[PDB]
Symmetry: D2
Subunit: 483 residues, 4 copies
């Protein structure tokens, strides 16, 4: 687009050791706008050779980056933070064009992403060691924290800026250097963040972005001896594989994988509050989010009222290009996601589910899918066991509390959940019984930089943001001082 | 008869509060490494029994984690008391099946008991957080919850401490545990389970499955209900177990190999370094993950250090662990003797001298002579491989940056030791050593209050200390909307 | 009372430097059973001289007591803990006879008191210091914790055992030594605990109990150069004085003073739960507790129903000697308390308050007072501005939320408060607005050893029990290591 | 002077509730340049009436200041931080003229003072509560932290900017409001900081500066019911009085009082390192610091060598006006300090001490004192028991380790101490035996914003800066939630 070429942050080259490079073979692959299908540019189709160069550059830069004081790195990171916020409109324009979400959501993500840079710039000055009461009066126990080393980050496409800073910021603040493999569907967001890193004074090699062959690059990131940690956000099948490859060198892991988030609305809940909350938890980013409400359980006594209000809100949605005014629902990332959504809806309907609205591709074509609502859904339908990653809201009837809790936990995942109830005992009892890493209690806007973000079970390991985020990128050194 | 007279000697496995044989009635013999005699047998269980233990642990998990932290602390402390009260009986079992001297066995029992007491107290202190809100309509309340069923696979070098170091923090966290101990030293694990039964630990909360390692380990690392694996052993096995745990994204705790370096600079307290290097090298006959594998000594004190060192080694009394004053027991098996002889032969063929020892001991069996090698350098295999034996390779060096590079020239990073009376050098070198634990003018670094673990391919996670219990917990972020 | 002479723990001499001593003047003051009026024994009437001997002994014992390891002190403190529980019946007997509370409550306090010994024996091993990320690469910042030194503890009569352990246990666990001045009304509990310390192997001088002249003993405790901290629990006027005397040497302070605890019952509260909870908060220890509900605010829409059910429960109480079976309300500590209770009720009645039940001395005479309930109370009555410290429940009517919150905070105190409401927003809103250090939310049984016990404003400073209790007795040492 | 009339930060009026006011009586007191004696200007001589207005203004502004989010206050405080640094040269100019220290030191203090604003702006976002494991499965223990309320700060003259931020920054970041009474010798530094607070958008009443009658203003700060915490830095006798006045209302206390800092140089020390460190510890701010080396103990085996080198460095000092190039020693704050310094030198000389250099007023007159060095000092001299607060270095001979430690601790104070030794055992043994809150170990530049600054014994209570500085301005609230 001409609107892309007018920004200094639109880069069609990779970023390795402070240089803007093409692949050694000069090959390139195209990037497309999911709302129009047109090609917006190309990126280098790099592979193992270039990925190794990045690791080597990150390792060399590691020695002098960790030697700086915490305040040295904090000042640089804050300059990075300032640049990200000053270029909010331009970063959002890139995101909407290559990823498809509305411009308002893209700007929100930019601010959400920038807050992690500021947060961890401050954490770096506060990663405290310990002094442990000795069991032997001739020894003193002094515990310190040190960076793991070179970090490998593999990021997805649904949040093409926040998933970068959520991994790069804590890594850098910890004294680590990072090599990044971004999704080929949304690479320009990562490269734009790297361009601002250059302007912020982040030395060469501390942050590297390698685009192209995912398997070849990922293979090097998960095997190279100098990569000490792998942080990955994406599907669970890919997570199983990456962790498998990391086994040969015992690499530290940080995984944020799939999520089948249940949203439970009891009959004693604030009905209007639960509806607006469920609307937000379901249709944000067109439902293409790991913490999106994949199952909405509603009690029998309010099922009819809830469904009617819920459908009324869904029918107000404006679907179209993310650059249009007032647009709320963008297109799905690719055709496979459309096919997955149509299958799960067809399966549900074949088992008695009704379509309250939507249920087919949108008139705009491309990968646009109609915002949909299903009623009469039960546990025998595949849409209860699989992630939709689309704007499809299955409303599941229930009555007994012990039964809905069992259904909510009847999944390999355990990322985010949501409970709506004005009864204090029920609210706490259910939140504690839910086997999830995050539980919204009469709230669904749970995302921010100060709370520990992550899941349990097969939703992954580790936490991003919060006081717990920085320790993920550090190791413990126990000094036994003999006096 | 010495162990038949012990109520703690058990030749059956422990699953869901029952003393079971294998479904096939198959058993495997256990031998005394100092004499060669067969002590008894243990069930040779497989995948079926391993699955029964996982199921039993999951059923017991619901009511075990429902108790209060103080309820569990009381039960754990009764377990702690019984362990210390049966120190002599436990040490007798360990020495007979493992080989180490009776004095070392008693020390491990107390060391091991301290973990039960430590984590009984930690269970009452798994603090959550209240985080300052970014939105005045919400409150951020963070809590900690048990991961669930834990699978523990333990080695033979510390057959009791490696059990409590994993089972104690798991139980204190509200978890239940299934344990696969080493077939060379199973009776120590079964004796600890018999005490657990006497301490009132409910059925299924702790289970010990003996026999086929590959079959039992395959179930532990794949069964959907097992949420965490904690393993201590060789790195190649750790790689395999981590790989198998990948299909269900299991949480990991790994304590693997360790090629521990010990550096003695010329400004060190010479006598203090010698006594420290002796302790770090010859404890448990050198069969320890944190044992001094490489002993770097500066050129200006190399000769003096080697002389004093050899003098101490030649005082060692080698023999049966039950004899008075015995300090060096036998190696665990014949493979260890062959490895040690191969590594010494390679070093000698490249210029190394044998200051003492260097061959099997006159007592036969798996006894190996306490040995000291001089003129060792980095081209020898003994510097790149773990000996797990009473062999001390003394390596000469001069430059500080060079010995630091040699110390880090390894895939491991468990324990390291530095001796120097210069404050700035002691801190500079310790901070440059890529290890999870660094002894600074000290080598007796083991205890229950310090975080025990390594970096790089020496593994992940920590045992003991304030950090040991969070390994068995998950974080729950509650966003309360007002 | 020969039941006292038959226990090894009944001691009529003070405890200083491991010896059982009388006053240098051989002067004694009698102790009485408040339920019967009999003399049960005497205690030494010591003054400044003996108090100075205890401080000197504590300072000498401090050198070797703080040199031990945390595990060494833990073993000794746990032996002390074991002995306290093993002698629960004997300690409860002594308390009931000299203090008056029922034998069941006394046994509860002994177990409550014992838990502090166990808790802080464990805390002593965990007074972690810090390693702070340096701002100058040539220095390292290592923070450690050290005992403050000799501690002075002045305790009241309402909880004559728990108040001792709540101060002596953390002091000893921190590496400190303690000199104790217990209330002359209930000294045998303090001396009994000291006799068990001797049996537990606590070295001589580590714990000392000085009985007699409060002004003379307290003057030494608050001025001797070697006393580095004062921990006091009692009346606010005395607290002001002790703190003032502590000024000349800048002594560290721990004060738990008065508390005009309010208990608010909104109309959306579980009525039955609030009644039982308010009954417990008011009549425990016959109302003679710092956290007892002094003001019971009840909303207009449930005032009549709450009052009726509350009075029904109060009329079931059995009043009498604490040793009898099923006794729930004992006698007040002394005649002054009966006077003050009667005066406050008379003032309230003269301004429109009605006596629903009680309102005069009990038929048993002595210092027994009838469990009473007042209705139609308002803020103009003195019973709302003064602690009654007795079994009298003033039920105050309110309607507006902002007003009842203003009334609850309209006091110089800020120790404990209680709020009953099934509305989540109201419960948090009010609890956060109440200027108190402790707020029970749909609960009144708030006392235990793991939670931080203390107040704000003129209710005092510092906390007892919990992770925060041991730091009170430690100082910080910042080591700046230059490399 | 006209150089002050040319900066917008030179204010000759007080700052109360966002207004620039004169005293109700219009009375004024003069401020003088100690280097020239000239009158620089006047400040309002306010009293109790105006101090009460400030408290009322701080209490009113408190309600809305604490209702903001931690990030809200962080943004405002960081704007304040940016302004302080942007106006470094102007702030340093004011300090050098009214306080006397060299312009280079003043600029250093500005940066030092600014770092506390940044540090606590970040701490405000990290004042974490707790969730304690329950002892009763029907309750949940949620611990939160709340601001103590209006804070009263009384600051000295030796660091007329850093002492302001070291108290106002954590107070504001905690959600508190502050009223400040600065030293009449250096008021313009405090008012200039207030002018920058106004520009930074800090609302009216959140920060107030009352100048004039110290006792009258201090009496209101230490007695008004709404002042909940006093933080004071100054002389121990004044601290004793302020604490005594705070007793009537049980106000929370933070005190940083006197400090008879010993510096011990053993014979196994890096001689040159110990000399340069002793020079820095002694003559920074012309020796007018609470942590300045008041006693310099030097082992007998290196006493002659240490002295010769020490006097060599002292004789290189350039004494003169703080605005002149290369000046390193400025004038003392007033004439009383010159007299006290001469008295302590006379007493030492009368008991055998030798003057190696200096020992009298400087040729420049005014309050300039010659940088002096005394040898042959011993414990019987007054200079060893009294703070000299001047450029006078008493070198004290010693031999035995146990003796020099006993001499170091033979004081009521316990603020800062320094030890130089290349023996690891001795360095740790001695540092652990020194009853001080801060110990430099082969280092004397111990001051920075991330380390806990404070003393033990009669040197005061509490800590400033570091992870421990913010809790001093918070209270703990224990919520016992009943399910």
């Amino acid at each position: 687009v001409s609107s892309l070429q007018s920004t200094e942050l639109f880069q069609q080259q990779a970023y390795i050791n402070g240089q803007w490079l093409a692949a050694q073979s000069n090959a390139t692959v195209p990037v497309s706008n999911p709302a129009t299908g047109e090609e917006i540019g190309t990126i280098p189709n790099m592979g193992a050779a270039e990925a190794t160069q990045a690791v080597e550059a990150a390792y060399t830069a590691l020695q002098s980056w960790k030697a700086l004081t915490a305040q040295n790195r904090a000042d640089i990171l804050l300059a990075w933070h300032k640049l990200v916020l000053d270029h909010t409109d331009e970063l959002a324009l890139i995101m909407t064009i290559e990823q498809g979400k509305p411009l308002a959501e893209a700007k929100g993500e930019v601010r959400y992403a920038a807050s992690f840079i500021q947060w961890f710039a401050e954490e770096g000055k506060r990663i405290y060691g310990d002094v442990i009461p000795t069991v032997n009066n001739q020894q003193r126990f002094i515990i310190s924290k040190e960076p793991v080393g070179v970090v490998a980050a593999i990021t997805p496409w649904n949040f093409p800026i926040a998933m970068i800073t959520r991994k790069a910021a804590p890594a850098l603040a910890a004294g680590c250097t990072v090599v990044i493999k971004p999704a080929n569907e949304t690479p320009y967001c990562a490269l734009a963040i790297a361009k601002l890193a250059e302007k912020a004074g982040i030395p060469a090699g501390v942050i590297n972005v390698v685009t192209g062959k995912s398997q070849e690059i990922g293979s090097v990131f998960t095997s190279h001896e100098k990569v000490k940690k792998l942080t990955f956000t994406g599907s669970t099948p890919v997570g199983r594989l990456l962790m498998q490859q990391c086994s040969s060198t015992i690499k530290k892991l940080a995984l944020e994988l799939g999520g089948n988030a249940p949203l439970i609305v009891f009959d004693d809940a604030d009905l209007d509050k639960a509806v607006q909350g469920a609307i937000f938890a379901k249709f944000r980013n067109a439902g293409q989010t790991c913490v999106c409400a994949n199952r909405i359980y509603v009690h029998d006594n309010i099922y009819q009222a809830f469904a009617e209000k819920f459908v009324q809100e869904v029918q107000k949605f404006k679907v179209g290009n993310g650059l249009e005014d007032g647009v709320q629902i963008g297109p799905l990332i690719n055709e496979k996601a459309v096919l997955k959504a149509q299958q799960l809806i067809d399966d549900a309907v074949s088992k008695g589910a009704k379509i309250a609205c939507g249920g087919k591709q949108h008139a705009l074509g491309q990968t646009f899918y109609e915002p949909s609502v299903l009623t009469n859904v039960d546990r025998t339908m595949e849409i209860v066991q699989e992630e939709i990653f689309g704007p499809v809201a299955p409303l599941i009837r229930f009555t007994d509390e012990a039964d809905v809790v069992a259904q909510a936990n009847d999944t390999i995942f355990g990322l985010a959940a949501y409970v709506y109830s004005e009864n204090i005992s029920r609210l706490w009892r259910v939140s504690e019984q839910l086997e999830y890493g995050m539980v919204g209690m009469n709230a669904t806007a749970i995302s921010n930089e100060v709370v520990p973000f992550g899941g349990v079970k097969q939703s992954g390991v580790g936490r991003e943001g919060s006081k717990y985020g920085l320790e993920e990128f550090m190791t413990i050194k126990y000094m036994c001082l003999g006096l």
